[PDB]
Design a protein around this ligand. Structure first.
Ligand SMILES: [O-][O-]
Ligand SMILES: [Cu+2]
Ligand SMILES: [Cu+2]
Ligand SMILES: [Cu+2]
Ligand SMILES: [Cu+2]
Lengths: 74, 276
């Protein structure tokens, strides 16, 4: 049950960050709601029906979804 | 009240449904349904309190949420009822559902923007206000993020499951509810959200009017499951932390229990529903 490792990268032009808190993700400094499923997969509020294996994968899915759009604070 | 397959609506019934939905939007009532759904999907967790999603109450909760929305539509036009979208049958972008006289089509590829139908941003009649990002226009990418809607044979495999739900009563469960929801197995409800794309793939998925027609067909599949399994009923039946038991009330209403929602015929019937 320990949390995933933190991460920080530029993905498709945007900075994505993740850190244990139970886990927080940011896209260009704006927090992105993410959640962990029982089986260890992740989703985000902009991909909430679509499990992906890791919080970085959920952050990257959000950047894909956003097509350049600023995230609004949650 | 009869809920009909969208594919069977007359031109006048499509006109009246669209107008009732647009009036709920204009008056500000529609956006509060979007807001309620997003609040629950953000709060429902597998290891904590869970009511609208990823839990046995997924089905009675959406049944009651859809009843709230249908009653709001009927306050504008009493002849309107919620239609349902059988995505196992109407599975391509050529479906009449997606015609400009009903819901409009897929979004253009540059930015996902829906360009036709009554809910296109250009009409001025469908601002996206309850949102997670700067974009204020309806978006869709039908078939963009997943290649196929569920097939009838897949649906039948799930309908054959006899247990309603099973411990631990969350996204890891075996049983009918979680296979219909889609977190395990060949994936019915979650995959349809992914297939539509745009706001339908997000926590603010009621921003797309197709939300209602999707969940009205999920709700019909629960009624079909009950006819296939008269010896099975909602579980759990008491004393379960974090989960809505059969006789416990559900948020946000607080005054209704899963037990009050098991028999849909108290509220509506379907155009056709298989017998046992
Ligand atoms: O549940 O959307
Ligand atoms: Cu949902
Ligand atoms: Cu969430
Ligand atoms: Cu849903
Ligand atoms: Cu029998």
């Amino acid at each position: 049950p320990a949390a995933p490792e933190s991460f920080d990268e530029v993905y498709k032009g945007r900075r994505i960050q993740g850190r244990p808190a139970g886990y927080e993700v940011f896209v260009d400094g704006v927090q992105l709601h993410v959640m962990r499923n029982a089986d260890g997969s992740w989703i985000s509020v902009v991909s909430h029906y679509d499990p992906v294996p890791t919080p970085r994968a959920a952050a990257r899915a959000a950047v894909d979804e956003l097509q350049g759009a600023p995230l609004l604070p949650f | 009240t009869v809920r009909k397959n969208q594919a069977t609506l007359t031109a006048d019934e499509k006109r009246r449904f669209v107008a009732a939905v647009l009036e709920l939007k204009r008056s500000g009532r529609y956006d509060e349904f979007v807001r309620t759904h997003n609040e629950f999907i953000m709060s429902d967790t597998d290891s904590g309190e869970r009511t609208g999603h990823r839990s046995p109450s997924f089905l009675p909760w959406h049944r009651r949420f859809l009843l709230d929305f249908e009653q709001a539509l009927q306050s504008v036009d009493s002849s309107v009822t919620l239609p349902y979208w059988d995505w196992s049958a109407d599975r391509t972008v050529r479906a009449s559902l997606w015609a400009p006289d009903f819901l409009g089509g897929t979004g253009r590829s540059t930015d996902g923007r829906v360009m036709d139908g009554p809910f296109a941003a250009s009409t001025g009649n469908w601002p996206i206000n309850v949102r997670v990002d700067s974009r204020t226009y309806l978006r869709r990418s039908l078939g963009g993020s997943v290649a196929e809607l569920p097939t009838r044979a897949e649906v039948e495999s799930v309908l054959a499951i006899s247990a309603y739900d099973l411990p631990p009563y969350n996204s890891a469960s075996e049983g009918f509810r979680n296979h219909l929801e889609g977190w395990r197995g060949v994936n019915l409800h979650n995959r349809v959200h992914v297939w539509v794309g745009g706001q339908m793939a997000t926590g603010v998925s009621p921003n797309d009017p197709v939300f209602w027609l999707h969940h009205a067909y999920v709700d019909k599949l629960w009624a079909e499951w009950q006819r296939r399994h008269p010896d099975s009923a909602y579980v759990p039946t008491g004393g379960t932390p974090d989960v809505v038991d059969l006789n416990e009330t559900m948020k946000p209403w607080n005054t209704v229990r899963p037990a009050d929602l098991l028999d849909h015929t108290a509220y509506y019937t379907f155009d056709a529903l298989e017998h046992h």
